[model samples]
Structures are given as structure tokens and as C-alpha cells.
Target: ETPIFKIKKLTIAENDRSEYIRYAEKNMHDSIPAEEGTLLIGSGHDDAHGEDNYEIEVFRNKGAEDLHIAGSHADDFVETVNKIATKQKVIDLHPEVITTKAQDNFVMRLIKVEVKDADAEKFSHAVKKEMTTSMASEPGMEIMMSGTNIDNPNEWYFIEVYANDEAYDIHVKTPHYKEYIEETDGMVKSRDVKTLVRDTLATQGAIVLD
Candidate 1:
């Protein structure tokens, strides 16, 4: 079954974050399908270049398609956010799940990286090399997949899953991972990283695929 993912970006006043999060939580209970899916709401860091909040909703089987066909409900969700938000953008993702060595504990991460215009290509190459090396060398590095935004070439999204916190610790200390960070020091304009708690009700199998 193909998994459908929706990533929504929102810009709201700093003080409104808590309120928005509450609203999203309530919305999820009413809007999300009862089975085979996950909803993640995260606050964007102040240091990040754009957007102040994010909402990531994942559905299994035909949930996404059904949502799209469910009339103005999805649009209403957007409108609701718009009323309280300063700005918003939503993107649909087709994830190509990457496999890795299995382990007991799983930790997932969602990362958004913005590259400096002049170093976009170089940054991409460096990150690609690091991702490749980590996946091949680290048993804990389960998923290291990335995709470019259709509307923004300089923006990149990464999904990383580790066996556990130890795995993630080991990954950052790797020579290649270190090099990628050091080399891309000035090349990366901003980065937002969020740790995700798996919602078993929404997730199935080892991981879902496109």
C-alpha cells in the first residue's frame, strides 16, 4: 500500500505556538483517519530562515486520496490555520523509504535544510556523500533519504531513522558526518531538526512506502 504524506508550513506569532499546537491536536482527532497513519506537529526554531511551525500528517493505504476527495474539509483545515497564521504552505510527499540494519529501538527524525544559493550544488554533493557513507557504515542508521521541494530548488527535506539514541550519537561522530557539517558550515543557511514519536496506530510494517 502506498503511504501518503502531507507537510504543512506555518508562520505564526511566537506567543501563538502553544495555541496552534492545541488546535492541531484537536483537529487531528476530528480530521485524521482512525487507522494506519501518524500526525506530527512541530515548532520551527527561531534560528530557522523561514516559517515558525510545521505539521506533518501521514496516512496509509488510500487515506490521502480519500482526504482529497472528502470535499472542503482539507480546505477548511487550511483556512483555519490561515486565520491564526501569518503564512502557510503545504506540500505532498512521496517517500522512497530506504532500508537499513534492524535494531530494537527506533528513533526517527525530520530535517529541513536550506542551502545558500551559491553553494547549493556543493552542499548537495557533500550531504549526499555523508548520507551514503553513514547508511553503508552504520548499523543504526536505518533511513537516510532526502527529496527536493518541487517549488523551491534550494530547499531539501531529509528523513532519518536510527536504531536508538546511541545509533544517532554514533552517526554524528562518524568521519563523513562530521565532514559534511564542517564543510557545509557557511553553505547551509538554516536547518530545522525534529525528533518524531512513532504513532503505532498510523504506522504499519517496518515503514511505509510511496
Candidate 2:
């Protein structure tokens, strides 16, 4: 069976960001089991598109039975945060698996894009085309997984891994990427890109990093 992947989005009040980050780094980063089929590849909190009251925490998981186990742990974490901060929303996303395997010294990025309500379908088609072109033509592009929120069609999430910094630099200069940026100019409401540190223990065979 193909490995199961899951992405969870948590929105919490601004004041609790620091506390949550600490908890995630200490408890979440250190405790998730890779051998048991569940790995916490990446987890972090970020301010949502300049929004002060709302902050975002994302968790990526892979495996079968351990996915639900990770979710249970997240539920408890959220409960703890709710005592001090308002829980704005929780989004569950099923990311499509891409064939490219990660390299030892790759650059990983987490990108969140919110499409304009009216241009969602158009934007999605354009993005799909661009992604396909990149995967086919860009040798340095290792992983390109994209998914839409289960509840909100306009919200999209992308996980990109490049062979290295040079590969990523080349990716941004590619024709397909340039076209995507130009075509989606104002059609995107907000785009947030974040660099992630891959946890080697959690990643195991899923992603290789030196």
C-alpha cells in the first residue's frame, strides 16, 4: 500500500504563538515516532498574512495507523492552547503524493496560497499546468505536492523540495514559474512561503538530509 500522508492546520491567537512553538519543538518534534509509521516532518507557527490575531501551525504526517494517533496528540495540544487562546479553525488536508524522492541536502518550502473566490477554478488549472511542466522539465525539482483544503476549495497548500539552494534559484527563474507568477498576479489573495527544517529522525526514508 502507498504511504498515507496528512496535513493539519491549526489557527490560534497571536499571544499564544510563542508558547505553542516551544511546546511543538519540545514535545511534538521530539516525541513523534518514525519507526511506528508516523513522522512529524515539519511543524511550526507563523502569522497569517499579516493578521495579528490569527497565527497558523501546520503539521505534516505520513503513515497508516499512526496518522490518527498523531491527530489525537494534536487534539490534546489544541485543548491545552484553547485554555489560553481562542482556537480559530482546524483544517485537514490530504496531499497528493508526488513521485520525486527527497535528496540529502535539499531545500524544503511550505507554501500557502489563498485564491480569489471568483478565480479559484481558473487559478487551480493554471497552477496544475505549471506544476506539471516543472515536474517534467526541472531536474532539480525533487518533490512537488499540492493539496486543497477539504472544507475550502480556495485555500491551497504546496510542499516543494529542491535538490539544493541552486536548484531552488533555478526553479524560480524557470519559464513555467515566471508564467505562473504573472498569470496569477492579483488572482491570489495571499501567498505565504516558509522554509522548513526537515527532522532526520522523523523523516527516516521519507526524506533524506545530510
Instruction: Give the whole-model CA lDDT for all candidates, comma-separated.
Output: 0.60, 0.58
Best by lDDT: 1
Error of 1 at 118 (Å): 1.4
TM-score quality measure for candidate 1: 0.54
lDDT by residue (tens digit), candidate 2, 1-210: 334444544555656656666555444544455334443344434323311222222233334434534564556655655665544554555443333443356676778888889997678778777777887788887667676777777888887767788988888898889899998899998988877543221332343211
> Per-residue CA lDDT of candidate 1, range 20-55, in tens?
655555555555344334332222323343335656
Instruction: Looking at model 1, report the run of 10 residues with the lowest lDDT sum.
Output: 199-208
RMSD of each: 6.6, 6.5
Candidate 2 lDDT score at position 45: 40
In model 1, which runs have C-alpha deviations exceeding 4 angstroms?
1-89, 93-104, 200-210
Best by TM-score: 2
